[PDB]
Design a binder for this molecule. Structure first.
Ligand code: HEC
Ligand SMILES: [Cl-]
Ligand SMILES: [Cl-]
Length: 104
């Protein structure tokens, strides 16, 4: 995906509730640093729903592609009230940005 396009998508659609940098603050949603390769519900210091803790998947490109299309379909009962991104290329670009930004 296109990291530069994905950053803009993140800012427009996600930054209201999320940070990505190491040591970044929790907002309505958790800081996302270290997301890839981690089970759901594991950001340090954030209180998740039981639903997000129970999901028991590992975040990576494929599981994010699915989640971000329709969050409540993937994790029923989640407190992330976000409609989703319908277009696959936009999800891919966002996820490429996340893969970079949450790993530095
Ligand atoms: C507020 C209105 C949000 C917006 C907009 C987005 N997210 Fe979110 N997210 C939010 C909350 C409250 C939570 C916790 C959910 C719970 O049920 O406890 C989350 C969670 C995520 C997760 C899962 C994190 C984990 O399991 O550690 C991810 C991967 C995530 N959010 C990503 C994300 C992205 C990329 C967004 C823009 C497209 C986005 N969220 C919007 C709140 C909100
Ligand atoms: Cl709960
Ligand atoms: Cl991956």
């Amino acid at each position: 995906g296109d990291v530069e396009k994905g950053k803009r998508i993140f800012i427009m659609k996600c930054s209201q509730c999320h940070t990505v940098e190491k040591g970044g603050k929790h907002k309505t949603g958790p800081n996302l640093h270290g997301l890839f390769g981690r089970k759901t519900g594991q950001a340090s210091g954030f209180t998740y729903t039981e639903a997000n803790k129970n999901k028991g998947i590992i975040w990576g490109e494929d599981t994010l592609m699915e989640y971000l299309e329709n969050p409540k379909k993937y994790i029923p009962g989640t407190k992330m009230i976000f409609v989703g991104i319908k277009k696959k290329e936009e999800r891919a670009d966002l996820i490429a940005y996340l893969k970079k930004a949450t790993n530095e």
